[PDB]
Design an enzyme around this catalytic site. Structure first.
Site, PDB file in Angstrom:
ATOM      1  N   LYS A 123       0.761  -1.147  -0.122  1.00  0.00           N
ATOM      2  CA  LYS A 123      -0.123   0.080  -0.071  1.00  0.00           C
ATOM      3  C   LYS A 123       0.904   1.142  -0.087  1.00  0.00           C
ATOM      4  O   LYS A 123       1.826   1.281   0.798  1.00  0.00           O
ATOM      5  CB  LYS A 123      -1.114  -0.105   1.245  1.00  0.00           C
ATOM      6  CG  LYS A 123      -2.127   1.086   0.938  1.00  0.00           C
ATOM      7  CD  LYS A 123      -3.018   0.640  -0.143  1.00  0.00           C
ATOM      8  CE  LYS A 123      -4.423  -0.256   0.677  1.00  0.00           C
ATOM      9  NZ  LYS A 123      -4.861  -0.939  -0.422  1.00  0.00           N
TER      10      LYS A 123
ATOM     11  N   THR B 183      -3.466  -5.696   0.480  1.00  0.00           N
ATOM     12  CA  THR B 183      -3.003  -4.264   0.631  1.00  0.00           C
ATOM     13  C   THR B 183      -3.746  -3.509   1.566  1.00  0.00           C
ATOM     14  O   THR B 183      -3.351  -2.902   2.513  1.00  0.00           O
ATOM     15  CB  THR B 183      -2.777  -3.346  -0.795  1.00  0.00           C
ATOM     16  OG1 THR B 183      -4.053  -3.210  -1.502  1.00  0.00           O
ATOM     17  CG2 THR B 183      -1.867  -4.369  -1.661  1.00  0.00           C
ATOM     18  N   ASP B 184      -5.057  -3.659   1.551  1.00  0.00           N
ATOM     19  CA  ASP B 184      -5.929  -3.213   2.527  1.00  0.00           C
ATOM     20  C   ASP B 184      -5.571  -3.526   3.953  1.00  0.00           C
ATOM     21  O   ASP B 184      -5.744  -2.678   4.917  1.00  0.00           O
ATOM     22  CB  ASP B 184      -7.399  -3.556   2.190  1.00  0.00           C
ATOM     23  CG  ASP B 184      -8.553  -3.108   3.072  1.00  0.00           C
ATOM     24  OD1 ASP B 184      -8.757  -1.776   2.635  1.00  0.00           O
ATOM     25  OD2 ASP B 184      -8.717  -3.321   4.249  1.00  0.00           O
TER      26      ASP B 184
ATOM     27  N   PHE C 242      31.300  30.520 -10.955  1.00  0.00           N
ATOM     28  CA  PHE C 242      31.744  29.242 -11.905  1.00  0.00           C
ATOM     29  C   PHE C 242      32.444  29.678 -13.000  1.00  0.00           C
ATOM     30  O   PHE C 242      32.072  30.398 -13.925  1.00  0.00           O
ATOM     31  CB  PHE C 242      30.203  28.698 -12.304  1.00  0.00           C
ATOM     32  CG  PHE C 242      30.579  27.458 -12.976  1.00  0.00           C
ATOM     33  CD1 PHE C 242      30.953  26.423 -12.296  1.00  0.00           C
ATOM     34  CD2 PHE C 242      30.079  27.174 -14.352  1.00  0.00           C
ATOM     35  CE1 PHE C 242      31.269  25.111 -12.888  1.00  0.00           C
ATOM     36  CE2 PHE C 242      30.090  26.065 -14.803  1.00  0.00           C
ATOM     37  CZ  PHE C 242      30.630  24.908 -14.167  1.00  0.00           C
TER      38      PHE C 242
ATOM     39  N   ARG D 148      27.563  35.313  -9.152  1.00  0.00           N
ATOM     40  CA  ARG D 148      26.208  34.727  -9.748  1.00  0.00           C
ATOM     41  C   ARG D 148      25.313  34.488  -8.674  1.00  0.00           C
ATOM     42  O   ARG D 148      25.741  34.274  -7.471  1.00  0.00           O
ATOM     43  CB  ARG D 148      26.293  33.637 -10.592  1.00  0.00           C
ATOM     44  CG  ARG D 148      26.654  32.396  -9.724  1.00  0.00           C
ATOM     45  CD  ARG D 148      26.744  31.322 -11.017  1.00  0.00           C
ATOM     46  NE  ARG D 148      27.192  29.962 -10.331  1.00  0.00           N
ATOM     47  CZ  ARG D 148      27.273  28.626 -10.776  1.00  0.00           C
ATOM     48  NH1 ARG D 148      26.718  28.317 -11.825  1.00  0.00           N
ATOM     49  NH2 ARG D 148      27.393  27.941  -9.748  1.00  0.00           N
TER      50      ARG D 148
ATOM     51  N   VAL E 223      28.405  24.074  -7.739  1.00  0.00           N
ATOM     52  CA  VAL E 223      27.510  23.285  -6.817  1.00  0.00           C
ATOM     53  C   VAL E 223      28.311  22.114  -6.372  1.00  0.00           C
ATOM     54  O   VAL E 223      28.557  21.599  -5.134  1.00  0.00           O
ATOM     55  CB  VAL E 223      26.363  22.983  -7.686  1.00  0.00           C
ATOM     56  CG1 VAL E 223      25.419  22.140  -6.569  1.00  0.00           C
ATOM     57  CG2 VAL E 223      25.519  24.043  -8.122  1.00  0.00           C
ATOM     58  N   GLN E 224      29.275  21.378  -7.361  1.00  0.00           N
ATOM     59  CA  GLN E 224      29.909  19.920  -7.137  1.00  0.00           C
ATOM     60  C   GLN E 224      30.704  20.470  -5.739  1.00  0.00           C
ATOM     61  O   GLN E 224      30.661  19.571  -4.730  1.00  0.00           O
ATOM     62  CB  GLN E 224      30.573  19.964  -8.176  1.00  0.00           C
ATOM     63  CG  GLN E 224      29.931  19.166  -9.327  1.00  0.00           C
ATOM     64  CD  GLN E 224      29.627  20.225 -10.277  1.00  0.00           C
ATOM     65  OE1 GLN E 224      29.149  21.492 -10.054  1.00  0.00           O
ATOM     66  NE2 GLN E 224      29.502  19.899 -11.674  1.00  0.00           N
TER      67      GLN E 224
ATOM     68  N   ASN F 282      20.562  23.084 -10.023  1.00  0.00           N
ATOM     69  CA  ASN F 282      21.140  24.304 -10.382  1.00  0.00           C
ATOM     70  C   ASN F 282      19.964  25.254 -10.858  1.00  0.00           C
ATOM     71  O   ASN F 282      19.615  25.101 -11.994  1.00  0.00           O
ATOM     72  CB  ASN F 282      22.266  24.335 -10.966  1.00  0.00           C
ATOM     73  CG  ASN F 282      23.131  25.875 -10.875  1.00  0.00           C
ATOM     74  OD1 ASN F 282      22.639  26.637 -10.228  1.00  0.00           O
ATOM     75  ND2 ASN F 282      24.094  25.788 -11.370  1.00  0.00           N
TER      76      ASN F 282
ATOM     77  N   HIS G  94      18.370  28.106 -12.163  1.00  0.00           N
ATOM     78  CA  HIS G  94      19.296  29.369 -12.867  1.00  0.00           C
ATOM     79  C   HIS G  94      18.434  30.421 -12.936  1.00  0.00           C
ATOM     80  O   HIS G  94      17.262  30.515 -12.834  1.00  0.00           O
ATOM     81  CB  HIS G  94      19.447  28.847 -14.445  1.00  0.00           C
ATOM     82  CG  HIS G  94      20.378  27.663 -14.475  1.00  0.00           C
ATOM     83  ND1 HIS G  94      21.515  27.328 -13.849  1.00  0.00           N
ATOM     84  CD2 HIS G  94      20.023  26.316 -14.943  1.00  0.00           C
ATOM     85  CE1 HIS G  94      21.969  26.244 -14.204  1.00  0.00           C
ATOM     86  NE2 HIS G  94      20.985  25.741 -14.901  1.00  0.00           N
TER      87      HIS G  94
HETATM   88  O1  AZA Z   1      -5.612  -6.839  -7.164  1.00  0.00           O
HETATM   89  C1  AZA Z   1      -5.517  -6.717  -5.843  1.00  0.00           C
HETATM   90  N1  AZA Z   1      -4.106  -7.103  -5.337  1.00  0.00           N
HETATM   91  C2  AZA Z   1      -3.896  -7.164  -4.022  1.00  0.00           C
HETATM   92  O2  AZA Z   1      -2.567  -7.439  -3.549  1.00  0.00           O
HETATM   93  C3  AZA Z   1      -4.928  -6.571  -3.094  1.00  0.00           C
HETATM   94  N2  AZA Z   1      -4.979  -6.182  -1.739  1.00  0.00           N
HETATM   95  N3  AZA Z   1      -6.196  -5.569  -1.475  1.00  0.00           N
HETATM   96  N4  AZA Z   1      -6.828  -5.617  -2.746  1.00  0.00           N
HETATM   97  C4  AZA Z   1      -6.088  -6.185  -3.569  1.00  0.00           C
HETATM   98  N5  AZA Z   1      -6.270  -6.333  -5.052  1.00  0.00           N
HETATM   99  O1  AZA Z   2      27.953  24.909 -10.305  1.00  0.00           O
HETATM  100  C1  AZA Z   2      27.836  24.478 -11.609  1.00  0.00           C
HETATM  101  N1  AZA Z   2      28.107  23.289 -12.032  1.00  0.00           N
HETATM  102  C2  AZA Z   2      28.233  23.003 -13.193  1.00  0.00           C
HETATM  103  O2  AZA Z   2      28.407  21.590 -13.408  1.00  0.00           O
HETATM  104  C3  AZA Z   2      27.564  23.756 -14.092  1.00  0.00           C
HETATM  105  N2  AZA Z   2      27.319  23.967 -15.521  1.00  0.00           N
HETATM  106  N3  AZA Z   2      27.222  24.985 -15.998  1.00  0.00           N
HETATM  107  N4  AZA Z   2      26.987  25.760 -14.871  1.00  0.00           N
HETATM  108  C4  AZA Z   2      27.161  24.927 -13.745  1.00  0.00           C
HETATM  109  N5  AZA Z   2      27.521  25.422 -12.413  1.00  0.00           N
HETATM  110 AR    AR Z   3      25.075  23.863  -3.104  1.00  0.00          AR
END
Ligand code: AZA
Ligand code: AZA
Ligand code: AR
Ligand code: AZA
Ligand code: AZA
Ligand code: AR
Ligand code: AR
Ligand code: AR
Ligand code: AR
Ligand code: AR
Ligand code: AR
Ligand code: AR
Ligand code: NA
Ligand code: NA
Ligand code: NA
Ligand code: NA
Lengths: 295, 295, 295, 295
Positions: A10, A57-58, A159, A176, A227-228, A254, A256
């Site tokens: 679920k 799942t219920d 950069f 920047r 960023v790296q 990033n 921009h």
């Molecule tokens: O098709 C279904 N699969 C499940 O595993 C399930 N569990 N509740 N209802 C369901 N229906």
């Molecule tokens: O910080 C940055 N990393 C990148 O790899 C990059 N490429 N364009 N601008 C950038 N700025």
């Molecule tokens: Ar960063």
């Protein structure tokens, strides 16, 4: 044909929980979205219409609510571990539980400078997340993350010195805008089971707080070469501060902000040192990724 | 056939502006999304392919950037007034300018307890907005708003004594969760033109701050009889605090959080006084609206 | 203070209905999202915590499902009229019902060239909508619409002869891309009540089909002088084809596709007659609106 | 600390391309969103502010447009292969290119039953995608997919014989609604390089068409025992029809439609055989996943 891989369960289970201190009147709320996917001896549900192997799942949904009723839901690393451990222990034929939790912010309101006992604000769509993989015989693998932390600095980003060839139009810059949405993940040492997770519980909130503080301080204070280079500094600091983390991963757009040349209109000067008005670019965006470990 | 109504222009114009104090080093950023739609003697563009009456939407975009370069972009009530006034004054045949501004949050970062000179965080997707209608011969009509302010209180919300008939299943309650996304609008007295708007400039930030403070304090402190009764209290307080506002409008979803009966499982008690775990409901939602004026 | 305006009810009510022909085996599905907002003598719910005047939003939700069970849900103009009429007739103190319906596409699948009796596909997020305003003593006001109809033509769009001044950079063009998301609304003559709506039922599906066909054919075949000139042709044709419509309204974004000058790289020619690769622009966008009536 | 993994480049690059047959006048359009991420000897950009190893993301963007100008952009498997091969061949220090393409639908309009030469409609938000991983010395790994194919069947879906324990409330059913958003992926045999990809070009469009046809026919015709059993039948058929595919993967939400008991109101019968009106559930949703290979 044959089943090579299978998981089901679920998704998008919204959960709220309240704690009420009936002595102080202070109420605390938690809200999350939960996904639980199970693996195990379930191939016959796919191949032979054998529903006997399916925990509905219920029923997984019911189990999430019941587990939240029976246990604290914080930290999410612990809650996810309890929930995942339930499925592999309860069902002999279920061998893995994959629990993803997104934690939503409900920050206590300050009213007339006093914390309110039962009123909260969603201060931004920033999330705290966990991925908890509970695998029978292989313990508990936890990845913790913060995501949707949106920041901008208006200077002290550079950069230059990048590769220049016949595909290159980008001007070098020594001043920047830098803006990103921080997705930061820290990967814990494997835990043997729930006892070992419980033995480290305080470290989860503390390491999330460290990851956030280091991200914000490094972003604000680094006269960024790229960023790296900036994201690597965040990762190395977080590793230095928690020995139970093996790796730190950043995924950073990033976002921009382009200069607007207005010199065609009344000789207006809006570039370089005179740049005041910028065009935020929705797309495309740089996307920069690192996984940092111990050398 | 005939044109009964027409307006056109540029939507979704993203704008950033930086202010740099070169004496203190403190930088301040502003980011908005702007829409400008024009009306006037433009029917022939629709009926006769007469493009001579069209101020190109591309030129409207250029004008937004130029106006941001030539003027402060704050408060947005003033910026929108300057921008709208430009089009009706510059073009004899343009008789109305409809300016919508969405202001995005860039809150200065606090690093080690000190405000950072040039680093910002988007603390939540809450917006401050304006709709400025500049109509030749009819002055400047301003609606100010805050939107996407998401709040929850875990108690001190009630809903009983509502109409009960053969369509009614809802149980009365004396203790429930209340959560909403606040959309609050205050409508200014008509202004004669830019001079009158400028004469009131400080009131814009002050009235936005009042509207937000009153919303949060009333929400937190009102032992709510209904969304209706609580929102009315917010509106009446804002009207009491700014004589230049004519009306206050609230549009509030009731973001339901349902109890989960778990008594079918091991007699777990999770309703009424024992309610801890709730199911947040994505849809449907109550939607409650009021416009409040002076009696 | 005093209530100047008030409406409340339930939004985002998702509804599915199936019709089963047990003689042919053919099943037909309908899916919509419904909003019902009520007005009437309800000010005391806001001013005096008087919940006695509130038909609970939860009861409005129940009423939507019950009405769908008791009546056809198609055409949505009729369903909305039945639903709105229910509230003003049932409740002496409710004087207006405002019903908005969004209809979702479930198009029957063709399997091996044969229409399948019970399988459907969502062919695109295009919506058919109604706004039905049922006002005691003032009959039934219906606006019908199609929305999210996304189209593009790769040529036979022009834009030249627009105003050129010191704010203008846009090059005139005699051959460009035109792409939009069609929002088209037709406003019906006022109906006295449900009987008069029922007397015109076939016209609803027929006028929606006309509006869509005229939109697509005009877009495809008009050697467009502007968005303005093309949309006006659509409106005038729809008015000519249904005398019970008073007005037609279009709201059209100009979803720009920019040329990319590649001449800096190996003298590549990708502009004017040689333009093959374009940069779709997410923002900003032209926004063009018209309301057309009978002269 | 040390870099364990790193990739960077440009995401969300929107691309349009037109083909014009100047002999027939027929125009054909293509629109995609492209992401290119590079790996190689780039760790020093992170660790030592060494930008010399960075092919600027801006240059990657330019390269995408140039490659689209110099090559067909269809099928996307070929375009992605050409683009990825460019980066690992051009730059000695770049050792992998990871190319993701989302293809957007522009379906030719039929006007008065004739295909229009230059007008298109976005028939639904269904996507055709590729992930092309070009790895120096390891050839070209392609995963093809269709996604956002939204379908519903109103009967001939069952779910019974599932595990029932103290966590189970779900009633067995022999007749329910089944609705999903199809995400289907087919993983190609490894290709040695661009020549081998080119040698199979017709198979890409043919295998996408097969995957879609098999998905729709199986969904419509299978008297479904579960999502699990139905999706497995789709996978096994696709594997049977293309020997160059190694695996087929489905990821399917179970988009629940709940019965509404109306018996509390005038004894209305709307359950079991009398079920006509349902409540579509936005969340939570079952999520069912399989990867199927050859036995
Ligand atoms: O098709 C279904 N699969 C499940 O595993 C399930 N569990 N509740 N209802 C369901 N229906
Ligand atoms: O910080 C940055 N990393 C990148 O790899 C990059 N490429 N364009 N601008 C950038 N700025
Ligand atoms: Ar960063
Ligand atoms: O069709 C158009 N209408 C306009 O008003 C416009 N302005 N710029 N481009 C435009 N295209
Ligand atoms: O505060 C509320 N107002 C209403 O009108 C309502 N209807 N159901 N629940 C409700 N809660
Ligand atoms: Ar929770
Ligand atoms: Ar701005
Ligand atoms: Ar409220
Ligand atoms: Ar429906
Ligand atoms: Ar148009
Ligand atoms: Ar393309
Ligand atoms: Ar299925
Ligand atoms: Na087990
Ligand atoms: Na004028
Ligand atoms: Na009435
Ligand atoms: Na290389």
């Amino acid at each position: 044909s044959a089943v090579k891989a299978a998981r089901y369960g679920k998704d998008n289970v919204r959960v709220y929980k309240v704690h009420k201190d009936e002595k102080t009147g202070v109420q605390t709320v938690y809200e999350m979205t939960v996904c639980v996917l199970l693996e195990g001896e379930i191939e016959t549900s796919y191949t032979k219409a054998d529903n006997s192997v399916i925990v509905a799942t219920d029923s997984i949904k019911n189990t999430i609510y019941i587990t939240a009723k029976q246990n604290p839901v914080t930290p999410p690393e612990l809650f996810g571990s309890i929930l995942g451990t339930h499925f592999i222990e309860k069902y002999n034929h279920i061998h893995a539980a994959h629990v993803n939790i997104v934690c939503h912010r409900w920050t206590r309101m300050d009213i007339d400078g006093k914390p309110h006992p039962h009123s909260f604000i969603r201060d931004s769509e920033e999330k705290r997340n966990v991925q908890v993989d509970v695998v029978e015989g292989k313990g508990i693998d936890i990845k913790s993350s913060l995501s949707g932390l949106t920041v901008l600095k208006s200077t002290n980003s550079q950069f230059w010195g990048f590769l220049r060839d016949e595909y290159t139009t980008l001007k070098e810059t020594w001043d920047r805008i830098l803006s990103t949405d921080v997705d930061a993940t820290w990967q814990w040492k494997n835990f043997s089971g729930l006892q070992e997770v419980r033995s480290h519980v305080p470290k989860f909130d503390a390491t999330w707080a460290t990851a956030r503080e280091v991200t914000l301080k490094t972003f604000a204070e680094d006269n960024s070469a790229s960023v790296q280079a900036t994201m690597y500094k965040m990762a190395e600091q977080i590793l230095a501060r928690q020995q139970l983390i093996e790796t730190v991963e950043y995924s950073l757009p990033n976002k921009h902000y382009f200069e607007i040349d207005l010199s065609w209109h009344k000789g207006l000067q809006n570039t370089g040192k005179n740049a005041e008005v910028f065009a935020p670019q929705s797309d495309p965006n740089g996307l920069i990724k690192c996984t940092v470990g111990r050398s």
